[PDB]
């Protein structure tokens, strides 16, 4: 599996279950095409959003929302969606964690990059 | 000021000097209108973009172009940007601050509101 | 797995591999006993400090020596050692993961806990 | 000021007030010895630790007890501080600010040098 995304309550210290993900990539016109999506899972995670196969190089963007988690905890978020770009695989295939911390007022990431 | 911008580089242990950051305000039809933009000066901040009265309710994004700070180190960073979004609501004179720490591979931000 | 340790660069987007972790254990004359330790694997990850029939309620210290890691970099390092202290299944029984991020100038450590 | 500590609040938006600090220096034996401490301001921030003659070189720590600050919130929290550890070399005159960004299951902390 070499895209993965993890999301987390800094507040709870707990995963952040069911948040959308939606993975875009970037398409020769220079407009973003659809990739791959999901939604995480009780131990936060997403997997198996792609295969070596189909990552190929390119610029990718990571988009999450939060909506279905702040709400399931009786929260009315003033705002749910984070998002980060980058270039994935130029210097050959590679695995890639993606991890986001969330709190009311602030907001981590992470990538951890790994040769399979 | 109402509305500030402070960046710092986790690894050099110093203020992030001469980055570009752009605000948005989200406007009627849903989309991101340019607000104000300007460079972290040498303690990494950057103030005067906005005065009070400008700086209306609503929902601001502030991008950080962390990429060009990187590579002008010779780094080749993973993220375009750091971002933060954050509501400014209808109260008496508030101070915004927005905070952010830079690695190559990771980033936090903060929105800080002081009265 | 109750207890698990990660450690990140993020200067890098590495793990952090053969860092030592050691995990001790508030003792009832207010001493530090000696509970379990281990160094993190090529995912930066250590496992099997534990089990939940020894992982009991209490004050536990996790303190990590990054020297190793630093070395094999080729850096020489300034400091090498963080240490973090919580209460540990005050509720019930949890699962802990206790995550670092490593850069020259900052630290970041989360804890995310979960019910098994 | 050649020191001082800054300390946010990442679930209220806003800096974290009256924190007790602790400043230790590691002593000969390798013992850690109090050097300063202090309570943080309305605006999160403590200076007047050390002056600059002092504040000499050698390795530092940074204590801000994070548990008493959540359980006065009403909050359990995780850590029972935040910690930072860093390297005061012998140069010209520097200024160090150690910056800790708080949440009841998360920190980070950063030393900034500047000059
Ligand atoms: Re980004
Ligand atoms: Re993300
Ligand atoms: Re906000
Ligand atoms: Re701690
Ligand atoms: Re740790
Ligand atoms: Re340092």
Same mark, same amino acid.
């Given at each position: 599996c070499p895209l993965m995304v993890k999301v987390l309550d800094?507040?709870?210290?707990?995963?952040?279950?069911?948040?959308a993900v939606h993975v875009f990539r970037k398409a020769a016109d220079d407009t973003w095409e659809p990739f791959a999506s999901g939604k995480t899972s009780e131990?936060?995670?997403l997997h198996g959003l792609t295969t070596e196969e189909e990552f190929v190089e390119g610029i990718y963007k990571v988009e999450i929302?939060?909506?279905?988690?702040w709400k399931a905890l009786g929260i009315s978020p003033f705002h749910?969606?984070?998002?980060?770009?980058?270039? !994935?695989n130029d210097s050959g295939p590679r695995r890639? $964690?993606? &991890? !986001?911390?969330?709190?009311?007022?602030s907001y981590s $990431?992470? &990538?951890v990059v790994t040769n399979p």
């Amino acid at each position: 599996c070499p895209l993965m995304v993890k999301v987390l309550d800094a507040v709870r210290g707990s995963p952040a279950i069911n948040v959308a993900v939606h993975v875009f990539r970037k398409a020769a016109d220079d407009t973003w095409e659809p990739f791959a999506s999901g939604k995480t899972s009780e131990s936060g995670e997403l997997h198996g959003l792609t295969t070596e196969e189909e990552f190929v190089e390119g610029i990718y963007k990571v988009e999450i929302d939060t909506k279905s988690y702040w709400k399931a905890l009786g929260i009315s978020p003033f705002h749910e969606h984070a998002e980060v770009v980058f270039t !994935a695989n130029d210097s050959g295939p590679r695995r890639y $964690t993606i &991890a !986001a911390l969330l709190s009311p007022y602030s907001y981590s $990431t992470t &990538a951890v990059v790994t040769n399979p």
